[PDB]
Design a protein around this ligand. Structure first.
Ligand SMILES: [Mg+2]
Ligand SMILES: [Mg+2]
Ligand SMILES: [Mg+2]
Ligand SMILES: [Mg+2]
Ligand SMILES: [Mg+2]
Ligand SMILES: [Mg+2]
Ligand SMILES: [Mg+2]
Ligand SMILES: [Mg+2]
Ligand SMILES: [Zn+2]
Lengths: 202, 128, 76, 214, 70, 95, 119
RNA sequence: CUCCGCCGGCACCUUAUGAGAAAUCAAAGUCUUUGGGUUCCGGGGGGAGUAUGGUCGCAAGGCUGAAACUUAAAGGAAUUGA
């Protein structure tokens, strides 16, 4: 036999260092930390990572109008990753600094009423999390072993500090959504190469 | 420095306010168990389970998120079946829900059972 | 709630949090309602989904995430 | 005229709601007072207090007038608005709009016997703002509203006909006193009664219902 | 598990951490029952060799002391 | 109003702490409240190090350093600018 | 004292945007070019604006630049960004992982898997 | 000396879902949805910890401790200015 979709994913995530957590583990994140190394760096349970990507994917696909989902990254590594992720699901990409007030302030030129919000890291993308808590906006976030999980509905346990990890997760997430929508047939061949998501340093 | 059934009921409220699934009650007693039966038959708690390693003994209660408050009235008054009405109004949220548990010589029971059986007794607590 | 004549007299029966059974009120703007899509067969989606509501109390605590995970573990 | 800037204001303008309770059901924030003023037809406002507050400046002291406006229809909706602006008339205008935005539903009950139209608050409820706390107790039909002038005004707009009231703290600070009553009346849906014990049946929100229109 | 981590009495059911153990020396292949937390110097009655050393915790076995929990 | 949480000194579990004499004015202040700097200085500023190493007869003599631990009271520490009035928000930084 | 204010700064960026190729490095040609793409009320202000378009276009001609979005520059950053290598550099031939990572793989049931080896 | 766990201490940091007039407080929390046990103590500001009686002390003083009268504020936390 060959590998299932899960196993190809675990192979890819294990190649992207997605399992590598940080030195700390938040008490809310401990339900995913499989164990701790002698170096003291925790290990993320890649098993649990997979269903949360599936859980996140089922939430995404039920959003009937994708332009009404927003995806964001404060850090520079997630810029190219989230920009392409939006290009393929139809979401709305907001890369860089978030203008404070874009979910609460209705007279602001930039303004929105998203039904779903996907964030690269709660610790660096704190401001949109705090804003979505004022607008009944549910939240999806990639959470490292020390991400503060306040106002976060679906936290995917995953390395979100790495150049390869961030782009790998979004590529892997965008794949799962397209399958459910039917734009990609059964049969994992998705000719969009994974390296497209990793950003380029000029 | 212990006076139990305050420790038990305050543990449940604190567990409930947080929204927990189960509570542990380290000292238990027959009085405390009979209070939980009254709570349970009225629908404010799920089942619960006694632990016997020997001792006063432990009990774990499973909470269903629909008890609002449960209190003990230490300094247990005597309560004729005639002033039930005055303790009802002071201590209960309204004339529609909520129960005052009174220990009476026909057993521990809620103030509703007390009127039907026409017994007064000594107040233990209330829940609603 | 119900008149003792038969009529129901409340306006707005509220939602309750699916994780804590707390009432979700009109001004609880931290509350969220999630729709989890159902995948069925080839293609893997039709317009069937499960709806859960989360209290603003639960999200502020941080255990919104753990509750959704433990709530989505139901089989049907 | 209107030209809405929010999804909800848009959906209200096409004429795709009947009442505020669909919005209340899913806890949407109301950011345009045009929404409430069509959905609640018989909505009555009123100024209760006009207060001047001052800050000290090198030149002198700049007065500002802060207005307290209570709005609501006397069958279960009230709002409270407060706004400070340099001129009294414009202070009231902002106060009306802030009040209409804040409309909340108020549930009622019966004193003892669930007969006829509900008239009191259902159960004991209390609210706190600052040092002032207001208590409300159910009253037999036709006890009247026994309360001070400030909370009595709020309750007539709420449609409550009978209630026993208490207070604590400095009620002479009319700001905290009117507001704590509003907190009391707001959270009457906060109380999980046995009649609400049934599992809730969910429905899609407006932002998921009228997706195609958006 | 972690019930072996929680404090002796804070466990769901109280249980002692201590145990009893059979110790054999080299100059007298007899078998001696000792307590894991002895508090008393115990000499095997046969050869008279000291067999345990009390401390603030578990009794200390010495050079040439095989033991088996029982 | 309570300006500080520690009360202006480090004293927990203790009842009494022995005082010290300020270097500048000799005001008595407790050892856990004083401003204590360990100063490591040179016998001569770098203006006059070469023209004093030109005079050392033995090659390789490194000029010794004066070691001292200087104590100050609050008023002398403020007046000399060893510590400054900080903002309310910066009052809590101990680095 | 010759700090250029908002009007000179804002117009200078904006005027380059609408007309980039049409400009040059000559201040006087830039002054003349600026004369026939706008209506202004003082020649002193014109030279100030043309003064902030001349060297600004060195720093544009030299490197990148802030809010001003140049088409020939901003397409080509996008064109070079929409790029992929000859195949995925994230390859799965050799994934060297620590024992406690393998222990996780075992707990998942995947102790044996392509290309994973203890160190 | 390095890592992990338990118990008991002196504290610290981050945060409310909490409380508070607030400053702040993980105990000043589990309070009008008000009840674990118990001791001491306050009732606008002064007069006043004064007078007097008692009592303890070598003394200095300690403990107990009013009244007549007077007065609309005194006071607490925080804000803007100067
Ligand atoms: Mg001061
Ligand atoms: Mg000590
Ligand atoms: Mg002292
Ligand atoms: Mg310790
Ligand atoms: Mg008094
Ligand atoms: Mg007095
Ligand atoms: Mg004082
Ligand atoms: Mg003051
Ligand atoms: Zn000094």
């Amino acid at each position: 036999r060959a590998l299932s979709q899960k196993e190809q994913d675990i192979q890819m995530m294990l190649a992207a260092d997605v399992h590598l957590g940080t030195k700390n583990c938040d008490f809310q994140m401990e339900r995913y930390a499989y164990k701790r190394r002698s170096d003291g760096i925790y290990i993320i349970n890649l098993g649990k990572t997979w269903e949360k990507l599936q859980l996140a994917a089922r939430v995404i696909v039920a959003i009937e109008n994708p332009q009404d989902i927003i995806v964001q990254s404060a850090r520079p590594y997630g810029q190219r990753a989230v920009l392409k992720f939006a290009q393929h699901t139809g979401a709305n990409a907001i890369a860089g600094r978030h203008t404070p007030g874009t979910f609460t302030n209705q007279m602001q030129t930039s303004f929105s009423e998203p039904r779903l919000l996907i964030l690269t890291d709660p610790r660096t993308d704190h401001q949109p999390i705090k804003e979505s808590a004022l607008g009944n906006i549910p939240t999806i976030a990639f959470c490292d072993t020390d991400s503060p999980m306040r106002y976060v509905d679906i936290g995917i346990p995953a390395n979100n500090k790495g150049r390869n990890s961030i782009g790998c997760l979004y590529w892997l997430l965008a794949r799962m959504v397209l399958q459910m929508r039917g734009t990609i047939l059964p049969g994992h061949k998705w000719d969009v190469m994974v390296d497209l998501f990793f950003y380029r340093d000029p | 420095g212990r006076r139990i059934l305050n420790d038990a009921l305050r543990t449940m409220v604190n567990a409930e306010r947080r929204g927990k699934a189960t509570a542990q009650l380290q000292p238990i007693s027959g009085v405390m168990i009979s209070f939980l039966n009254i709570m349970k038959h009225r629908g404010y708690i799920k089942n619960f389970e006694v632990f016997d390693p020997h001792r006063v003994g432990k009990i774990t209660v499973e909470l269903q998120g629909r008890i609002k408050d449960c209190k003990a009235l230490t300094y247990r008054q005597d309560l004729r079946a005639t002033e039930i009405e005055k303790y009802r109004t002071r201590m209960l949220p309204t004339r529609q829900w909520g129960y005052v548990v009174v220990t009476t010589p026909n057993g521990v029971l809620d103030h509703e059972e007390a009127i039907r059986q026409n017994v007064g007794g000594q107040v233990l607590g209330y829940f609603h | 709630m119900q008149n003792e004549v038969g009529d129901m007299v409340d306006l707005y029966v509220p939602r309750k949090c699916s994780a804590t059974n707390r009432i979700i009120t009109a001004k609880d703007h931290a509350s969220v309602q999630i729709n989890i899509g159902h995948v069925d067969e080839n293609g893997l989606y039709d317009g069937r989904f499960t709806t859960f509501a989360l209290s603003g109390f639960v999200r502020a605590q941080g255990d919104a995430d753990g509750s959704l995970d433990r709530l989505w573990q139901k089989r049907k | 005229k209107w030209v809405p800037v929010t999804k909800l204001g848009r959906l209200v303008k096409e004429g795709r709601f009947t009442k505020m309770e669909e919005i209340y059901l899913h806890s949407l924030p109301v950011k345009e007072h045009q929404i409430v003023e069509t959905l609640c037809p018989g909505l009555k406002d009123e100024v209760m207090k006009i207060t001047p507050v001052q800050k000290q400046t090198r030149a002198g002291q700049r007065t500002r007038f802060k207005a307290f406006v209570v709005v609501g229809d006397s069958n279960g909706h009230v709002g409270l608005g407060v706004k400070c602006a340099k001129e009294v008339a414009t202070a009231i205008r902002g106060a009306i709009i802030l009040a209409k935005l804040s409309i909340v539903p108020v549930r009622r009950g019966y004193w003892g016997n669930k007969i006829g139209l509900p008239h009191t608050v259902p159960c004991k409820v209390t609210g706190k703002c600052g040092s002032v706390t207001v208590r409300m107790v159910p009253a037999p039909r036709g006890s009247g509203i026994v309360a001070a002038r400030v909370p009595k005004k709020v309750l007539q707009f709420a449609g409550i006909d009978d209630v026993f009231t208490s207070s604590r703290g400095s009620t002479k600070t009319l700001g905290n006193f009117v507001k704590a009553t509003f907190d009391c009346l707001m959270k009457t849906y906060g109380f999980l009664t046995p009649d609400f014990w049934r599992e809730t049946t969910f429905t899609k929100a407006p932002y998921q219902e009228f997706t195609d229109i958006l | 598990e972690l019930e072996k981590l929680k404090h002796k009495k804070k466990r769901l059911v109280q249980s002692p951490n201590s145990f009893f153990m059979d110790v054999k020396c080299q100059g007298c292949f007899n078998i001696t029952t000792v307590f894991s937390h002895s508090q008393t110097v115990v000499v095997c009655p046969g050869c008279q060799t000291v067999l345990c050393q009390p401390t603030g915790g578990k009794a200390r076995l010495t050079e040439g002391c095989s033991f088996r929990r029982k | 109003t309570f300006k500080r949480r520690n009360g202006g000194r480090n004293k927990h579990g203790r009842g009494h702490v022995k005082y010290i004499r300020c270097s500048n004015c000799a005001k008595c202040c407790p050892k856990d409240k004083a401003i204590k700097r360990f100063l490591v200085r040179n016998i001569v500023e770098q203006a006059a190090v070469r023209d004093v190493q030109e005079a050392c007869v033995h090659d390789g003599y490194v000029l010794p350093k004066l070691y001292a631990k200087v104590h100050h009271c609050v008023s002398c520490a403020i007046h000399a600018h060893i510590v400054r009035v900080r903002s309310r928000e910066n009052r809590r930084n101990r680095e | 004292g010759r700090v250029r204010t908002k009007t000179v700064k804002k117009t200078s960026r904006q005027v380059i945007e609408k007309y980039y190729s049409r400009m040059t490095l000559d201040f006087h040609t830039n002054k003349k070019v600026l004369e026939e793409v706008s209506i202004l009320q003082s020649k002193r202000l014109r030279n100030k604006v043309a003064g902030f378009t001349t060297h600004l276009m060195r720093r544009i001609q030299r490197g990148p630049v802030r809010g001003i979005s140049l088409k020939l520059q901003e397409e080509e950053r996008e064109r070079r960004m929409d790029f992929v290598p000859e195949k995925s550099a994230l390859e799965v031939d050799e994934i060297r992982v620590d024992k406690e990572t393998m222990d996780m793989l075992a707990f998942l049931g995947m102790a044996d898997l392509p290309g994973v080896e203890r160190a």
